[PDB]
Design a binder for this molecule. Structure first.
Ligand SMILES: [Mg+2]
Ligand SMILES: [Mg+2]
Lengths: 209, 431, 434
């Protein structure tokens, strides 16, 4: 298909060498299978096989969503949010993404479409001897400005990295507690918003490290 | 010719030194570094050396021109050549593991059979303290985890990149169950190319881990209480270009050749364990409660038996032998599975009934009723079974078989006499 | 009576607390401390407790009045402590068959019906190690050798205190000396009946470990605490007496050795693989049963010149005896002597002829020449000895189904835990290369 031709154009243009077949377990934790770019044609066609015991907390296929192909702004790497199906082809009803898709399709039968715009709060803590702590990086309060808010460069990088992945943020600010922050998301359909929430957590934790 | 192509790559990449790689009976890579001026001598009459290193006296290194590769870590550049060992007269040295696999493959080729192997290589990435390696995981990640939970993404990315630069195609890589554990799934290739590729991966992973101040290990059970590293070998047999394991008219689309191959492997599996699980530590991996198989059963994809028969059919029909560990000599391991599997096909050895029930959940009285055997519990126990297996001793040769027994019993006799810390912790204060 | 003598010693030495000692199947001493006011209740109807500790429910402690001894380490304020070895019995009154002391008593009573009495004189080897940060270590206190004298033997004051404390408890010792390994020592006991000797063995371990802690040291009866050096053994000098006279002596027979000696040796050697589970009960006990050290590994019997499993020393007459050199000091003495008595008496009863005496140095012989003489080997692992003990119907019936099952359950729990462990040797041997 053409979406697939689009993907391979971006691959040669940005020199993508590895692709992450992202997915999520029942607990919302992101999981992935890293494949070299040579296997991207196999992933977009018959799919990549793996073990589905991880989704719970033994054989399934990763089905990449071509609309979710994004180059990671940090040789280059790319990601693809995948839906899970059983080896025969039927969708696995244990996949959280497939569950939201079903419920949205039922709502679509009644002409209903839900739009969600979450306010994502999080903390930025210091690290001691390579391990994470619960010690706030900054001693800031509600809507505070630098140098009271020390995490202004990291938040600036988070929103910049998100914009570089077809993601639009409404606003970001320091929250009530020390080292606490919030990123307010723009309105979008439940599936795109949930994909965006997982991406934000991944980007925020990666840039914090 | 291939020699002319080698010398063109030499002048293009400015190669100044070439490594004449080879492996001992234990699977450890050995080499002779020669300057580029001696490359013509190596590809012609060969380079002489002392063959007593393979045991664990004089011979000649015969480079395989198809295995010429430039090492991506730029020095001037360096290159490598996987070598076959020959006696000074010219006849092949039967003690060379690569020659042993080549023989067994040539025997299979006479019957129109070609075995394709696609191993799942598990390994650990540990921290280094005071310049010495440790068993402390670099990351605190779990099954299929993503960064920052998986901190070894750049080292893994660098491994697969370096492999791709040496005519190597990887299927997928991911974080495994235990902390700091990872897996790199290889794609199907002939037994010889796959074994060459397995040795290259271990060399590249350990070299690149040292570059980042880490230590990569293919040890079967480096940490007690967590999952151990395995080498699940996806095996497929091909007869005259077509998949010999596929039959569309047979039940479950499984040919009789698949059943007889499985039956042959399971008949000699206790003896194969000495080759595929060769260290004393390999038996600390073969314990219940972890991904590793302990009971001798074969079944479908849903259950985790010693031999698995996955869903893919047609040209992708195959079995998955999940008993081996990544510390085995791949040349000798694939030769042992080929010889046992082909003996089953030849003698028409029927395998036992498929055990689709969860074998771990069954009580000992239920397992006894179904007649489920167990893999050897110790290295001594597997070597005793390997000693009596006349098929595998003849397939690997009296030279390789004796060297395996001598090295394993030297390790076992040293290990059994040792007073381990567990004994001091359990008996010193009370007794 | 003996109870009246106990209460006179109580008032004389000012005893305020009494320890109702007993042992579990593993030979570890257990006790119930009672104030002196409850001593009359202990000697009369007995003290109740929980018998789940013996295996590894409600029962009664039955003190043996002949075992009343005042502990020489005087307590605080002139107050003194005393001990009493107890037999276990069920609430109804019947003796509880799971008690190791009761098992030895039964086997001795069965021997007494036929007029046989076994006398034992064990050679108790042990190590004296340093303590670091309040925890025991395997570092020898001294760097002494075989029969060494101070200052090479630094543990002369503590050994002197051990023998002095034992003499103060009706215990006579033959001799004590430094052994081959660094910080290793041996205390040779005098000959006595199997019950008194087993009581004495338990007392020695308790006294040695208590006095070692007083000097900031740790005494251990572990079979092989250090790799590469000699291990601690318990060579049991055994003699059988029929109607007051030595049943092992015959002045007209060759070597002045009676047929009863040969049949006793034959019986012990027949069941020695099974006896090893009792006499060498720990996983560590098999690290001691390795060549190159004093410990026997091959199943042979011979004269004094050669070191074998069973050795028949030169002394004759009333001192005629055999020396079973396979046991280690970590074994339960009550069970070890019961197993040797049952196997030895079965040999005498069934007239079991022992194999030919191997006077040649067995260690120097090649592996080919050993099979030709029919030379066997002791079990290499604890699981291997337990498998042999499980099939020995004589020893399982002699020790009882309760004791035998408890030994198998404890040994297999330790084995299953030990076999799954990843020892440091494996990391040292394989981590860097593989
Ligand atoms: Mg697998
Ligand atoms: Mg002696």
């Amino acid at each position: 298909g053409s979406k697939e031709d689009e993907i391979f154009r971006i691959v040669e243009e940005k020199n993508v060498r590895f692709v992450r077949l992202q997915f999520v377990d029942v607990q919302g934790i992101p999981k992935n299978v890293a494949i070299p770019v040579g296997q991207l044609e196999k992933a977009l066609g018959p799919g990549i096989h793996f073990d589905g015991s991880s989704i719970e907390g033994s054989d399934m296929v990763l089905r990449p969503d071509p609309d979710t192909f994004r180059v990671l702004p940090w040789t280059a790497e790319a990601r693809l949010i995948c839906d899970i199906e059983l080896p025969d082809g039927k969708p696995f009803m244990g996949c959280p993404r497939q569950v939201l898709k079903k419920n949205m399709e039922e709502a679509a039968k009644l002409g209903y479409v839900m739009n969600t715009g979450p306010e994502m709060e999080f903390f930025l803590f210091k690290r001691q001897d390579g391990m994470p702590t619960n010690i706030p990086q900054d001693r800031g309060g509600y809507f505070d400005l630098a140098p009271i808010d020390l995490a202004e460069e990291i938040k600036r990088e988070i929103v910049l990295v998100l914009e570089e992945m077809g993601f639009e943020v409404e606003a970001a600010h320091h929250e009530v507690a020390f080292g606490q922050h919030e990123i307010d998301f723009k309105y979008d359909n439940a599936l795109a918003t949930a994909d965006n929430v997982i991406t934000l957590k991944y980007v925020a934790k990666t840039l914090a490290l | 010719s291939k020699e002319d192509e080698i010398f063109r790559i030499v002048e293009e990449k400015n190669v100044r030194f070439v490594r004449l790689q080879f492996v001992d009976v234990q699977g450890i890579p050995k080499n002779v570094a020669i300057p580029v001026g001696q490359l013509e001598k190596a590809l012609g009459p060969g380079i002489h050396f002392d063959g007593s290193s393979i045991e664990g006296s004089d011979m000649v290194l015969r480079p395989d021109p198809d295995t010429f590769r430039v090492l991506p870590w730029s020095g001037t550049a360096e290159a490598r050549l996987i070598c076959d060992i020959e006696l000074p007269d010219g006849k092949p040295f039967m003690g060379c593991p690569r020659q042993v696999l080549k023989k067994n493959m040539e025997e299979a080729a006479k019957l129109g059979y070609v075995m394709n192997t696609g191993p799942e290589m598990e390994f650990f990435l540990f921290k280094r303290q005071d310049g010495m390696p440790t068993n402390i995981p670099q990351d605190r990640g779990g099954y299929f985890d993503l960064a920052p939970i998986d901190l070894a993404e750049e080292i893994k990315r660098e491994i697969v990149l370096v492999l791709e630069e040496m005519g190597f195609e990887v299927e997928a890589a991911h974080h495994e169950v235990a902390f700091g554990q990872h897996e790199i799934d290889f794609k199907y290739d002939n037994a010889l190319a796959t074994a060459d590729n397995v040795i290259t991966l271990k060399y590249v992973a350990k070299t690149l881990a040292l570059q980042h101040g880490l230590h990569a290990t293919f040890m079967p059970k480096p940490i007690f209480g967590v999952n151990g590293s395995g080498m699940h070998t996806n095996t497929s047999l091909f007869k005259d270009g077509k998949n010999a394991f596929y039959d569309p008219d047979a039940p479950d689309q499984i040919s009789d050749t698949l059943r007889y191959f499985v039956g042959g492997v399971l008949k000699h599996i206790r003896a194969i364990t000495a080759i595929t699980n060769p260290l004393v530590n390999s038996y600390k991996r073969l314990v219940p409660g972890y991904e590793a198989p302990v009971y001798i059963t074969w079944s479908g994809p849903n259950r985790s038996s010693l031999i698995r028969v996955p869903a893919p059919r047609g040209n992708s029909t195959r079995i998955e032998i999940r008993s081996p560990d990544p510390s085995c000599n791949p040349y000798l391991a694939f030769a042992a599975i080929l010889a046992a599997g082909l003996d089953g096909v030849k003698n028409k050895i029927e395998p036992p009934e498929r055990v689709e029930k969860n074998i771990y959940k069954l009580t000992e009285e239920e397992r006894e009723k179904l007649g489920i055997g167990m893999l050897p519990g110790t290295l001594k126990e597997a070597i005793e079974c390997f000693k009596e297996d006349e098929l595998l001793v003849s397939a690997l040769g009296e030279h390789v078989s004796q060297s395996i027994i001598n090295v394993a019993m030297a390790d076992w006799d040293s290990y059994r006499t040792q007073v381990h810390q567990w004994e001091l912790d359990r008996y010193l204060q009370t007794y």
